[PDB]
Amino acid sequence: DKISHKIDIPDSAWTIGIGEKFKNAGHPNVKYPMIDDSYVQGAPLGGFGAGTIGRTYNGGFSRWHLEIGKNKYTTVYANQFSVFQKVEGNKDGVAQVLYAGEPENGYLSSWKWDYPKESGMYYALYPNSWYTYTNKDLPVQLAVKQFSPIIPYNYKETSYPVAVFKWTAYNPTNKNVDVSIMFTWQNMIGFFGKQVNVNSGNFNKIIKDKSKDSEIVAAVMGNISNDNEEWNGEYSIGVKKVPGVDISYKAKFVTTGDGSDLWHEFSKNGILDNKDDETPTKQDGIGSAIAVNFKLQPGQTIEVPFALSWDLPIMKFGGGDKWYKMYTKYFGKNGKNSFAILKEALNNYQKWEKMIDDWQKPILSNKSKPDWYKTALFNELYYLADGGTAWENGKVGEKDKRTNNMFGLLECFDYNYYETLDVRFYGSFPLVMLWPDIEKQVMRQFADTINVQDSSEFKVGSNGAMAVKKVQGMIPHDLGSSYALPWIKINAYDWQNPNIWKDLNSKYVLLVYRDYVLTGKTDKEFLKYTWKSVKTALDKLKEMDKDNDGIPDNEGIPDQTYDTWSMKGTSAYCGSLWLAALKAAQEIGKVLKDNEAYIKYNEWYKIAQQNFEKELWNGEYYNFDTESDHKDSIMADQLAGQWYADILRLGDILPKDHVQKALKKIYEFNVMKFENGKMGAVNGMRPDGIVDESDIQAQQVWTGVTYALASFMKYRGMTEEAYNTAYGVYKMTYDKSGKGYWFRTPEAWTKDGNYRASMYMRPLSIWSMEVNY
Ligand SMILES: OC[C@H]1O[C@@H](O)[C@H](O)[C@@H](O)[C@@H]1O
Ligand SMILES: [Ca+2]
Numbered sequence: 082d083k084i085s086h087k088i089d090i091p092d093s094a095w096t097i098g099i100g101e102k103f104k105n106a107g108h109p110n111v112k113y114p115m116i117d118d119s120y121v122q123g124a125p126l127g128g129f130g131a132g133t134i135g136r137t138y139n140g141g142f143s144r145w146h147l148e149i150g151k152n153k154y155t156t157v158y159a160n161q162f163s164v165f166q167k168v169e170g171n172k173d174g175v176a177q178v179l180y181a182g183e184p185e186n187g188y189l190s191s192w193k194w195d196y197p198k199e200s201g202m203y204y205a206l207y208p209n210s211w212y213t214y215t216n217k218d219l220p221v222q223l224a225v226k227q228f229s230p231i232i233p234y235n236y237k238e239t240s241y242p243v244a245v246f247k248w249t250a251y252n253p254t255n256k257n258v259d260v261s262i263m264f265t266w267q268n269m270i271g272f273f274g275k276q277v278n279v280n281s282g283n284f285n286k287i288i289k290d291k292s293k294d295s296e297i298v299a300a301v302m303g304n305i306s307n308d309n310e311e312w313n314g315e316y317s318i319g320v321k322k323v324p325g326v327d328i329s330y331k332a333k334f335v336t337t338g339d340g341s342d343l344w345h346e347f348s349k350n351g352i353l354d355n356k357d358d359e360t361p362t363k364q365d366g367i368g369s370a371i372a373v374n375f376k377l378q379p380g381q382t383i384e385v386p387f388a389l390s391w392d393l394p395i396m397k398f399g400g401g402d403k404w405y406k407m408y409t410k411y412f413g414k415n416g417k418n419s420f421a422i423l424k425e426a427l428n429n430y431q432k433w434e435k436m437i438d439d440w441q442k443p444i445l446s447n448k449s450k451p452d453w454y455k456t457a458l459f460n461e462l463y464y465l466a467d468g469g470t471a472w473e474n475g476k477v478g479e480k481d482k483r484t485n486n487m488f489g490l491l492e493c494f495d496y497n498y499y500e501t502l503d504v505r506f507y508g509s510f511p512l513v514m515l516w517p518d519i520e521k522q523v524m525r526q527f528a529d530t531i532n533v534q535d536s537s538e539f540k541v542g543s544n545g546a547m548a549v550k551k552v553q554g555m556i557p558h559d560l561g562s563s564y565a566l567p568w569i570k571i572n573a574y575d576w577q578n579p580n581i582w583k584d585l586n587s588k589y590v591l592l593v594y595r596d597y598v599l600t601g602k603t604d605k606e607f608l609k610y611t612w613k614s615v616k617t618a619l620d621k622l623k624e625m626d627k628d629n630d631g632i633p634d635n636e637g638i639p640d641q642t643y644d645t646w647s648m649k650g651t652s653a654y655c656g657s658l659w660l661a662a663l664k665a666a667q668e669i670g671k672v673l674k675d676n677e678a679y680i681k682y683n684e685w686y687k688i689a690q691q692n693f694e695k696e697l698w699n700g701e702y703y704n705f706d707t708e709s710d711h712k713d714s715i716m717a718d719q720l721a722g723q724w725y726a727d728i729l730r731l732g733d734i735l736p737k738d739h740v741q742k743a744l745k746k747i748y749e750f751n752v753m754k755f756e757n758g759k760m761g762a763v764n765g766m767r768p769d770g771i772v773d774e775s776d777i778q779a780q781q782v783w784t785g786v787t788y789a790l791a792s793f794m795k796y797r798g799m800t801e802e803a804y805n806t807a808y809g810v811y812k813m814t815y816d817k818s819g820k821g822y823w824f825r826t827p828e829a830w831t832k833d834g835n836y837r838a839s840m841y842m843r844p845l846s847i848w849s850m851e852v853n854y
Contacts, residue, residue, distance in 0.1 A: 082215045083253040084222035087382055090211055091445055093455035094204040095815055095823060097138050099196060099212065100181035107820035110835035115495055117839065118144065118154040120821035123203065124210040125463055126229050129519075130407040130472025130488070131242035132393065135824070136227070138203035140180040140196065140212065148273040148311075149396040149406075150469040150563020152494040152840070158184040159267035159336040159368045162246070162387075163192070165351030166219050169257035169376075175218055176348035189340035193348070205824075206459050207231075208437060208466075220254045221377055223262070230426075230433040231466060233440050233515035238433065240407040240472065243422050245430040246387040252377040261351025263372035264387050265343070266318045267336045268302035268362075274312030274397070282306055284361040285332045285369045288319075288420050295428050296322035298330060300369035301420055305361050309477065311397035315419035317390045318371055321427040326375045326385055329353040336366035343370055350374075386430055390422035395477060400566035403477035407486060410474045440515075444851070454804065454850075457811045461847050462511055463824050468842060469494065471567055472519075487526060487568050488519050489560055493828070493841045498559035498574050499567045501842070502527065503642035506588040507785040510848035517600045521607055524596055527589060530557050530571055531614040541578050543639070548578040554621035556585040577644050583625065583633045583655040584641040586618040587662035591725045594665035597672075598729050599852070608669055616678060619666055622659070623685065630696070631688035632656050635706060643764070646778040650708035656693050657703075657722025657734070660686065664731045690734065702743040703735075705765070714773040717751045717762040718786050719743060724793040728852055744794055748802045752809070756832055761787035761809040763832075772832075781829040784810050785843025792849035807850070 109115040122144060127133035135144025142160040145153040158180075167174030176193055183194035200216040208231040214223040226247045230238040252258050271279035282305040290297045299319025306313060320328055331353040334343040346353050351374050373385055394409045394416050405414050412418040426433075444455060469491035475483055489499035490508075500523060512520040535551035551557060551572055558579035561567040572579060579585060593611045597604055625633040633655060635641070635648035641655055648655065663686040670679030697703040705714040720743055726734050733740075747762065754770045755763040763772055764786065765779030773779040787810050794803035813819040813834065814826050820834045826844045827836040 082213065082222070084213050084215060084224045084249070084251050087251050088211065088224050088226065088249055090204050091206055093445065093452040093459070094206045094211070095456050095460055096202055096204050098199065099139060099201040099203055100198040101138075103821045105818070105820060107822065107830065107835045109837065110831050110833070111837055115838070116152060118152075118825065120823070122824040124205040124207045124460070124824060125467045126227065126244035126389070127242050127466055128229055128231065128238070128240040128408060129466055129470050130240055132391070132406075133466050134244070135467070139182055141182060145272070146467060146469065147391065147393065149471050150398065150491065150497060150567075151273075152469075153273070156182070157267050157269065157272070158186070158189055159265055159366075161265050162225070163263045163265065163347065164214070164219065164223065165261040165263070165347060166221055167259045167350070168220060169259070174259065174351065176344070176351070177219070179212070179214060188337055191339045191341040191344045206441070206456070207463050220256070221250055221252045221258045221260050224249045228433075228437065229466070230436070231462075232433070232436050235436070236516070236518060237411060239516070240411070241422060241425075242391045242393070242408055243426045244389045245426050245433070246389070247384065247430065248387065249382065249384050250375075250377060251382050252379055255379050257379070258377050259351065259374065260377055261347070261372050261374040262385070262387075263347055263351070263353070263370055264318050264320070265368060265370045266300070266302065266316060266389065267366060267368040269316055270302065270304040270314065271312055274310065278364070280362050280364060280366050282361050283367055284359055285367060286359050287330055287332050287357055290420075290424065297424060297427055298322070298328045298371060299420055299423055300330065300332060300371060302369055303417075309395065309416070311393075311395045311403065314391070314393040314416035317419035317423045318369065318387065319423050319427065320371050320373055320385065320387045323383070323385050325383055326373050329355055329372045329374065331356055331370040333358045333367050334370060336368045338365070347372070386427060388423050388426040388430070390419045390426065392416055392419040392422060396471065398567055399562070399564035400570065402566055402569065404471075404473040405475045405477065407472035407474050451804070453808065453811050456815060457807070458847055458851065460815070460824070461826060461844055464826070464840065464842060464845055465490065465511060467824075468840065469497070469563060471499070471563075473568075485522060485525075488522055489567055490842060491563070492559070493838045495838050496574070497562045497564055499562065500526070500560045501574070502556060502558060502585050502588060503582070504785075504842050506592060507789050507846040508842035509592070509845070511845055513596050513599050514848055514851065514854050517596070521596055521604070524593055525610060526560060526568065527556060528611045528614040530560075531617055533571065539575050542576040543645075546578070549580065552580040554617045555580045556589045556618055558582070558585065577639055581625075581636065582640050583622070583635055583652075584658055586622045587655070587658040589618050590615050590662040590665055591658070591729070594669060594729050595725065605672065608672060612669065612673060612675075615666055615669060619662060619682065630692045631685060632659060632692060637708070643778045646765075646776045647709060648706050650706050651693065651696050652706040653697055653703040653716055653719035654721055656689075656697070657720050658725075659722070660690055660693060660734045661722035661726045661729075661731065663689065664726065664734060665729060668731065694735065694739075698739055702746040703739075709775075711767065711773055711775045713768055714775070714779070715746055715750050715766045715768065717747055717764050717790055719747070720793070721789075724789060727793065727796045728849065741797065744797060744799060744802070747790065748794070748799070748806065752806050755782070758805060759809050760813055760830070760832070760834070762790050762806060780831055781837070783829050783843065784814075784826055784841070785828070785846040788844055788847040789849055792846070792852070795850060796852075803850075807847070810844070
């Protein structure tokens with residue numbers, strides 16, 4: 082391996098061998114059906130709201146999120162980089178597809194598959210990833226750096242449906258070597274959203290652009306129809322000419338055949354036929370190829386950039402709404418713009434690279450933080466682009482711009498709900514810290530729902546009761562599902578009735594105040610916008626105080642985020658959240674000079690604080706609640722309210738000394754007595770040091786709960802404890818001794834390591850460990 086010295090891969094990059102098998106992989110621990118796409122994953126490509134593409138550590142384009150809100154795991158074998166090499170003065174060269182695998186069909190059987198083991202590495206530090214190719218049979222060594230321009234405080238390039246592939250080639254040998262790198266791509270118009278004749282009318286064309294200071298060759302893959310449907314638009318692949326390099330192409334090869342139409346050219350001399358053919362296919366799948374060929378002398382290095390774009394301007398949800406995607410603001414809405422997106426990337430990728438480095442550098446260069454932590458911190462951000470992310474630039478048919486662009490991130494794919502509020506309380510930290518205009522938009526979406534009333538009835542899944550869908554003054558659980566109508570039909574969740582949950586209204590308030598504090602305490606307009614909704618939220622929750630202790634009563638059913646774990650009376654969780662939310666509203670009262678509100682929330686806070694301490698402090702920790710079976714259980718999340726109060730700079734809601742003791746107890750029990758502290762914090766533990774078995778949720782580690790608990794510890798000066806607590810999450814996710822959840826971090830696992838709900842929003846909470854950014 083001499084190529085690694087020629088490129089700049091940080092030490093904290095997640096690493097795995099191309100072709101490596103992994104023996105210890107977790108699987109779902111529920112009886113019911115649940116996504117398991119295996120451990121062959123990698124860092125995603127594509128912007129926010131653009132639909133994303135998951136290219137795996139094996140090289141295949143396999144995890145498809147281009148249909149917004151859906152997850153389709155299937156390798157499109159035609160999509161690859163391939164290499165040709167011939168040493169000067171030998172009869173024949175070698176040609177090899179850079180994919181550690183082979184088609185399951187008999188399609189493309191002429192290509193050279195099964196890139197060998199022990200012959201390269203994959204590296205990820207999102208939004209960059211890299212592959213190195215160090216193969217006995219390839220004398221010139223190659224590396225590619227691939228990324229999308231995902232840039233904090235940038236709402237433009239961050240939306241783009243584009244990926245750059247920057248290749249570096251090095252000849253360490255004493256002989257001249259001819260090299261070709263070829264990009265192949267299937268014309269994927271109809272891969273989704275077409276019910277029949279999925280390839281019909283698809284056609285490819287070649288664009289040669291010789292503009293100012295660049296020559297670019299590209300293939301544009303489209304369809305002859307000018308319909309404005311979810312399925313229609315263009316893909317493009319292409320390359321920028323650099324000195325010492327020639328370009329060739331093939332406009333059309335058949336992906337539903339043996340592939341020799343392309344490969345017989347490539348495997349001869351790494352040079353394609355430059356054959357155009359714009360005729361449209363009917364039943365056969367088609368694709369295009371772009372190749373570069375060059376000669377490398379001993380010790381010579383060369384760099385050449387390829388790119389991929391996809392212009393699929395329309396997203397469709399299951400209820401029938403059709404929206405334009407955010408990037409159409411910058412490139413247009415007609416689905417004919419793939420080349421423009423590509424050309425932007427090819428001419429500006431160096432600038433985008435420097436911008437990525439500029440945002441990563443302050444964490445990367447802090448040598449007081451261990452590399453493993455940097456690995457998790459950056460890589461968990463995969464979920465922002467990958468979580469079914471929807472970012473609308475208008476409804477189809479509207480003739481003018483709206484004043485706002487609505488946004489939604491899925492909780493996950495198995496529970497297909499946008500912006501789950503009990504979840505985003507933990508999971509939205511990267512948004513507020515790095516894309517705060519998106520964050521504030523999401524919270525304004527929630528503000529607008531507060532007084533929405535929907536009297537229609539639904540059957541509650543857990544107990545078969547009938548409940549009203551949406552009650553005035555109660556915050557919704559979510560903003561809809563991709564199977565229905567995101568942003569229009571709310572509360573898609575129906576396992577419990579969220580209109581009687583005791584955490585949502587509080588978490589809403591704390592999220593509002595958080596967004597103000599963490600963006601510099603200057604945005605009074607945001608507090609003004611949200612103020613009525615905050616006051617309404619807290620007032621409705623006060624009404625759920627049955628026994629007059631100043632605190633909402635949990636009703637003996639699961640009426641909060643732990644949605645099968647019953648709480649009754651005053652709970653540590655909902656009670657601390659309530660306290661913190663009252664103190665937050667007092668502050669907002671002060672900022673907005675609203676004396677009535679300030680005085681009311683102060684008086685409610687005083688009563689409630691006093692009673693909380695009395696009812697639940699036991700000398701070592703705070704009890705789970707006042708009235709349940711196992712009410713003395715140690716809950717890992719018992720002081721979630723004080724966690725948020727530290728972040729919001731609201732001070733002590735509970736005595737300093739009592740907090741410190743409860744956290745040391747949580748570490749001593751929930752962490753260190755659960756599999757030797759190597760798997761995170763288990764949610765519930767009996768004071769005898771044994772896992773609480775009152776419910777499955779008590780026996781789970783929640784990844785986002787645990788990272789948040791580490792933030793809390795860290796800010797209370799329990800540094801060792803914080804990082805040890807977080808380490809178990811990292812280990813399970815990324816390490817060879819874990820369970821193979823890289824780029825699909827789940828909600829939860831049990832002591833055996835098996836999971837629930839891969840690709841989950843909550844563990845974005847890791848960014849709460851970085852709160853001064
Ligand atoms: O694991 C529990 C989670 O399950 C999801 O189905 C719900 O939407 C969340 O509200 C809940 O916190
Ligand atoms: Ca009460």
